[PDB]
Amino acid sequence: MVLYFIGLGLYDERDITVKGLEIAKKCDYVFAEFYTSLMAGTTLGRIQKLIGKEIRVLSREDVELNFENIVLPLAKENDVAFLTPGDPLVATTHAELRIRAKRAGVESYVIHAPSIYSAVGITGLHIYKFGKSATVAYPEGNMFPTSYYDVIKENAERGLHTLLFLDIKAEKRMYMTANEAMELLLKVEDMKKGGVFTDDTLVVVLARAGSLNPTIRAGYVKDLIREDFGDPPHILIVPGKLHIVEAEYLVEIAGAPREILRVNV
Amino acid sequence: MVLYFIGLGLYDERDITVKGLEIAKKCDYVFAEFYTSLMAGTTLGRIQKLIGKEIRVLSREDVELNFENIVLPLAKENDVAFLTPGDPLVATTHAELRIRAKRAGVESYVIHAPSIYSAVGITGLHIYKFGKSATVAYPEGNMFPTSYYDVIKENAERGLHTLLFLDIKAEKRMYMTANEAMELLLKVEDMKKGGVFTDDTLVVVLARAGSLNPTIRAGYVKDLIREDFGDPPHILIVPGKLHIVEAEYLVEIAGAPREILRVNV
Ligand SMILES: Nc1ncnc2c1ncn2[C@@H]1O[C@H](CSCC[C@H](N)C(=O)O)[C@@H](O)[C@H]1O
Numbered sequence: 001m002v003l004y005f006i007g008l009g010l011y012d013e014r015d016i017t018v019k020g021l022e023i024a025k026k027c028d029y030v031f032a033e034f035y036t037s038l039m040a041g042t043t044l045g046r047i048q049k050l051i052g053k054e055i056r057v058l059s060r061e062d063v064e065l066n067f068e069n070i071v072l073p074l075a076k077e078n079d080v081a082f083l084t085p086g087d088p089l090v091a092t093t094h095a096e097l098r099i100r101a102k103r104a105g106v107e108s109y110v111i112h113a114p115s116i117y118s119a120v121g122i123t124g125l126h127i128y129k130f131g132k133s134a135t136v137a138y139p140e141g142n143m144f145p146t147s148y149y150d151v152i153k154e155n156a157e158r159g160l161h162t163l164l165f166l167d168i169k170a171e172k173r174m175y176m177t178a179n180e181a182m183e184l185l186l187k188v189e190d191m192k193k194g195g196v197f198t199d200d201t202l203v204v205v206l207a208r209a210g211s212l213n214p215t216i217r218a219g220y221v222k223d224l225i226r227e228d229f230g231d232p233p234h235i236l237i238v239p240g241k242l243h244i245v246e247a248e249y250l251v252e253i254a255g256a257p258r259e260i261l262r263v264n265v
Numbered sequence: 266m267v268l269y270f271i272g273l274g275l276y277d278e279r280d281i282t283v284k285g286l287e288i289a290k291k292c293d294y295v296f297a298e299f300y301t302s303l304m305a306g307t308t309l310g311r312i313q314k315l316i317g318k319e320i321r322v323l324s325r326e327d328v329e330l331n332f333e334n335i336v337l338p339l340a341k342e343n344d345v346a347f348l349t350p351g352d353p354l355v356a357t358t359h360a361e362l363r364i365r366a367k368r369a370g371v372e373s374y375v376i377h378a379p380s381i382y383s384a385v386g387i388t389g390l391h392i393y394k395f396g397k398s399a400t401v402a403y404p405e406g407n408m409f410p411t412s413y414y415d416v417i418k419e420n421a422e423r424g425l426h427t428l429l430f431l432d433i434k435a436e437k438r439m440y441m442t443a444n445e446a447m448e449l450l451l452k453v454e455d456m457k458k459g460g461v462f463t464d465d466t467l468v469v470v471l472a473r474a475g476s477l478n479p480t481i482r483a484g485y486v487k488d489l490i491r492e493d494f495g496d497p498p499h500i501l502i503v504p505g506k507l508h509i510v511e512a513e514y515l516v517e518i519a520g521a522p523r524e525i526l527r528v529n530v
């Protein structure tokens with residue numbers, strides 16, 4: 001009669017909340033999906049061991065096409081949990097699943113967990129200053145769209161930061177690196193010439209947020225584009241106008257060029 | 266030699282992550298601050314019991330003025346944890362504390378936890394569509410500023426959602442309700458007349474995110490301004506142009522007026 005959407009966290013199996021773990025252990029059946037985001041520090045094995053229950057993994061089709069056929073039926077009679085990386089409902093399509101639950105007469109509750117949206121706070125950039133977010137899609141075709149570049153421009157003009165998720169191809173095990181996002185954006189800049197993403201643009205890279213020692217680096221594209229930020233996942237941020245304290249943290253904590261402290265008030 | 270910034274979550278003591286709990290239990294000393302945000306479902310007692318250690322609570326002055334005198338000294342010799350509501354570093358000033366740690370020769374690590382920034386995903390609004398965020402300050406003086414109203418206008422024009430934190434006075438135990446934020450914003454609208462926040466404006470209220478049964482309601486101000494959303498904390502959101510799926514979720518899950526499904530493409 002109850003379905004619980006439980007977030008697993010960002011890195012490993014301990015990034016789930018105590019509330020999430022306890023509820024999962026009390027559920028008759030436990031499902032999960034691992035295709036929406038990469039959790040670099042754990043496996044299904046470790047997660048299953050932590051919960052002490054076998055977990056039925058669902059594929060993208062299982063979810064998008066047969067969630068109401070696979071999960072909900074059982075949810076009508078028992079307590080069922082559905083696990084996902086990060087925060088359960090931060091994926092554009094996860095929310096709709098709550099609708100299918102309601103319509104099937106199943107009550108649902110959401111158990112939050114660390115998300116990259118809030119975790120970016122560890123970059124020192126003020127969270128309230130972030131504008132619209134976007135994803136740097138993997139280019140497909142000789143000619144491809146670049147709307148994510150327009151989002152950066154739109155935010156930057158308002159002096160707002162831009163969070164950029166980097167595309168992934170789970171089945172192919174392909175995870176776009178910050179380097180690839182930069183290479184790609186520099187090319188878009190030559191084509192659009194908006195002065196939005198140049199060799200001299202200050203950017204911030206956050207790799208493996210959630211782990212104890214993530215890579216946090218800030219600097220000009222020309223300097224970071226060849227830098228190794230470790231294993232994926234990577235996130236790229238294009239800051240808008242910095243507050244002195246933001247810049248202080250980027251210099252002190254992320255190794256940013258000292259000149260960014262001269263924010264030209 | 267190590268300082269851990271550990272997030273406690275949004276509602277109760279189980280909103281901390283398993284990683285956070287385990288690390289806290291291994292720390293020689295545990296500090297915390299509870300003034301930045303209200304955790305409506307727990308107490309210091311319950312948190313202390315969960316961790317199994319006495320917790321030295323620090324005041325705003327203890328932190329802002331003497332963090333390097335109270336916490337860091339011990340952090341230099343032992344493993345020390347600093348607990349905070351929600352996500353440790355989502356407070357504009359918390360990040361700077363990592364700087365004081367570095368400068369004192371103390372290594373620090375951040376343990377994330379549920380945050381209201383990501384938790385708003387439970388409203389069905391696409392997280393990437395949120396623009397700049399703002400706080401509805403408690404009015405002080407016969408005449409007072411209302412920059413938060415300008416943030417809404419700026420986002421709305423771009424068709425972006427606006428997340429609005431509501432002010433609190435911890436010592437006074439005063440927590441601004443969504444009703445009070447609405448009353449206040451309607452008054453600002455008469456004065457500024459930007460057509461940004463009217464009787465007919467669609468708004469979303471999220472109360473006690475993190476608890477198992479939070480209040481999620483969407484509707485026109487004229488209809489919600491007199492509605493009771495339960496105990497604090499409350500958060501107010503002014504959606505921009507809705508995607509059909511966003512509207513579908515607001516109607517189905519938050520009881521929004523069916524007419525919002527007619528988004529006037
Ligand atoms: N540990 C991590 N470190 C850096 N970036 C991460 C990350 N985890 C996720 N991301 C970014 O976010 C993308 C997934 S989008 C889904 C986010 C998830 N629903 C949440 O609540 O956070 C990843 O492809 C990557 O772009």
Ligand SMILES: Nc1ncnc2c1ncn2[C@@H]1O[C@H](CSCC[C@H](N)C(=O)O)[C@@H](O)[C@H]1O
Binds near residue numbers: 118301353474498
């Ligand atoms: N449980 C909750 N439900 C609704 N709003 C909440 C909430 N917890 C916090 N908020 C909102 O966020 C404000 C605190 S701002 C600090 C946010 C915290 N650092 C985090 O990581 O989330 C509260 O005053 C209220 O405006």
